[PDB]
Amino acid sequence: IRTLLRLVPAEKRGAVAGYAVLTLLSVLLRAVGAVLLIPLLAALFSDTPSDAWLWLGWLTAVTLAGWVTDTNTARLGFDLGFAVLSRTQHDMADRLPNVAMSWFTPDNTATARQAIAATGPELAGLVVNLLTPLIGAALLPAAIGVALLFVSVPLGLAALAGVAVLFGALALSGRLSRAADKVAGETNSAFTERIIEFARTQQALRAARRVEPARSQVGSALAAQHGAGLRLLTMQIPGQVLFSLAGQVALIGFAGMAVWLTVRGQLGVPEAIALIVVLVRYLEPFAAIADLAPALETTRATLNRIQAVLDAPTLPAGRRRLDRTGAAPSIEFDDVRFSYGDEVVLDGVSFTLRPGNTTAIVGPSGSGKTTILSLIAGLQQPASGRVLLDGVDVTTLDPEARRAAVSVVFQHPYLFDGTLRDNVLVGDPEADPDDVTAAMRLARVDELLDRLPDGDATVVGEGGTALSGGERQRVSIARALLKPAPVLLVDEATSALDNANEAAVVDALTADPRPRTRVIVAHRLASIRHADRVLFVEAGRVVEDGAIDELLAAGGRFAQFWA
Template sequence: MIRTVLALLPEGSRRTVTAHLALTVLSVIARALSAVLLVPLLGALFGPDPASAWPWAGGVVLATVIGWVVDHHIAGIGFELGFGVLDHSQHDIADRLTRTRLTWFTAENTARARQAIGATGPDLVGLIVYLVTPLLSAVLLPIAIALALLTVSWELTVVALAGVPLMLGAYVLSGALGRRADRAAAQANSDLTERIVEFARTQHTLRAARRVAPERSHVGAALERQHGATLRMLGMQVPGHLLFGVAGQLALLMLAGTTVVLAVDGTLSAPEAVALIVVGVRYLEPITMLGELSAGVEASTGVLRCLRDVLASPTDPLGPVHLEPTAPPRLTLRNATFRYGPDGPPVVQNLDLDFAPGTTTAIVGPSGSGKSTVLALLAGLHHPVQGSVLVDGVDAETLDGESRQRLTSMVFQHPYLFDGSLEENILVGDPDAPDARLHAAASMARVDEFAAQLPDGWRAAVGEGGAMLSGGQRQRVSIARALLKPAPVLLVDEATSALDTENEAAITAALAEDPRARTRVIVAHRLASIRAADRVVFLENGQVVEDGGVEQLLEAGGRFSEFWSQQDASTGWRLRAVEAV
């Protein structure tokens, strides 16, 4: 845990960490002395000359005051380091997630990222003061007391030092017994959280399917797993606590027994023996506190593990090349192969495609043929595991982050709108765009038609994920957002899938009539979108089956011609009443 905390600290914190460690050691020494000085203090107080106890009493007071002062400074340094952990981890997490490869975001890793982001500020700020510092003190104080006892009796030092590994070993072993169950419980809790969120978001679907009762859904199964994992965790913790308690009592008995033996043979006086009983309690106290900290240690370790996993997630490569195309660029896929996951089958393999500057290419093919993957490769959302993506002959992996962000604008098949106003969601494409450009893009995407009907117009809230708009309205907003961004490449993934025929034709015309010169690549199933293309590429199983103009491919009578005939026939389907016989 401490290694992970150190990794989360900002650069330049080494001196502060060293100061914190040095003061912690000084605090431990002061507390050890204040405890062990009780032995000569009581010996002198009940001896023939009670006045000789004053120097020892002064030593106890001095050590106690030094401990208080040092602890005050330790707390200040601890909070400084805690704020450093908070600031550094939050910024690093936010920056890392913007560069993490999308293939990393599995269900499990997404849950980890959510836990890392959800780590609260007070927990991270207080991590050093309320956990790390007490943890260090709990380990070091028994050792310091054992060494300080050397001034009283070497036998006591040996016994006290022998008790330290005994108790720490029991602590580690008890933690090991319950750690696996703790992780299972944490995983079950995380799964339950994900399922509850899913259960809340899909209420309309569940109610329509008559699956509202939690016990009949995935939530019910997650609740059962969480209940079972919690019981196993508690069952594993009981023997660990018993073992730890027995080890502590055994160490105390060893120390007390040695004290009695030394008192009986006259090495120690009765007052000194009584004082050593108090010292034994102080010796055992930090180890007991260590047991009380175990739950916090495990919880914090889980949070830190999530932070570490996110910060260690694989990132997309960034290069030094800055590229600002003044005209629509040429895009090239050269021998590109891509798969989701290291062991997954290739979605596209050894693919060679060239997209001429300023042209519109429609990519067509059956589901799973790799159409959306091609767009993701061109957009830089994914990177080929073999081969390359070229922009005007420059390898996209050598471009810097700013060049990549400015290069492409994309319309997704399932767009996501942020919880804000209609206007704010369109301005995501270009936050600095003037009103004239904003409304021009909105007009082309036919957003102005329904914006005028909303009570608050352009300032109408769209809800989380655009929940307050229809599917077609969300798609139009995303198209307006893409048209507003002054990118030289426009990538469109089934932009009209959620629109009716009339709006589909209007949007298709808007995309074709966009005044900005761009290289356009469109994934499409509908004929209206395909007709406006200069070129059609038919993909199947990640390979190019046909490539050419619309009329050329229709005359060839191949896979595209078959696809066109099926789509053309489906547009003429009509429902009619059937007379009863």
């Protein structure tokens, strides 16, 4: 319950206090309704049974008040559960794009997926499914025990003593089954990730024959998950036993005290028979809590994953804004240094890109030139040093102004599951259809429209897997060119393109009418014909720079690199 209050918005704290007051009031009315039976039957069996009308009226009033309170508790619990759901899911959706790139480790990415995947109805009705009955069942025998004190002090003390073993059984059941449940949750998450990999990497797994359950990674994860699942069922046996023993101990304590008072004459026979029914009402929560306790640990793990994602380290950001009406800014690296963990990618790299010129970045593979584009676009940030757009440190820029300043063609072009037009329109959803068609024409997407059966309405798979490699690349290029960013970063836009489409797209990138600062990464000299300046990036540092013809005549690493 403690972790839930952290996730509740500050807006809904007013409803939580009302929820808690009504939940306590509901438990009190249930206890008073159960204990009112004792005066009721005591008068009912007397020689003047008409006295029972007074107690029946109180029982009816407590019952109707029980209906109203528990209905309002359900309504408030429903609102609180969805209020927590909507706000925490929006916070995860709004925070994750700002989370640092290095945070998305395979374990953290699994955690993020599970947290978002918790949007289903199980998390939504949590306050009604779990907290409302858990709090009610836990406090009901205590409330009956407190209420019995008005009838007989030692009898109420006996009920409270029975409540002590209940919390004792609850604590021991939790502590015994925590380790097994934690391992069960870990293995279940592992199996989910391997299923996702199994469906995504299905081509490569089949070719490698690691696809049968006897051989595949998912098969091993299933074996571990089933083993952990059966162990969890084993370690819940002491929980079931301890709750049963707690119920029997409470029954023996309650019945023995009532019998002891009846023998001593401090308790009438009709009160004792009424107490049999109260004992049954007293022992029902001992069984309800047993059914609710296993779900409590699983919920705690779920909310822990949600809180972990909300606690992710957001990337630094400021509020500066470029003073350009979509005009070309200058770009510079000022002694930039960057590393992935202990691996240094860039150290001492420095360059300056003029606003209206097109610059090429080349060099061996694994040399850090995609890192340079990512730092320019703000996806990464330096460990030390600073990168400036138009003389403004991008780490101090508004995130809206940071992402409205750059449009990027990624090395591995990812497309979302949807129509081809929607992927193109992601660059600028409010685009004029004249502007969209111009973007499609420049990217040679018009070939796809005329050649594909469905045109721009062609459905793309998860990723760009329902299209060819060279076709998802052109759709991504159309997506980048549609956006009116003054900085255009091209990360191998012609890797998977034939020579004809490569030449057409390469001419289009330079022929893009609006002014921009263009940074192009290429492994093919035909794709950087128009670049005004070069940045040869080898071993993480810009070894040499100049024009293409200038470096070719120089006979440095450029000429050998293009031999």
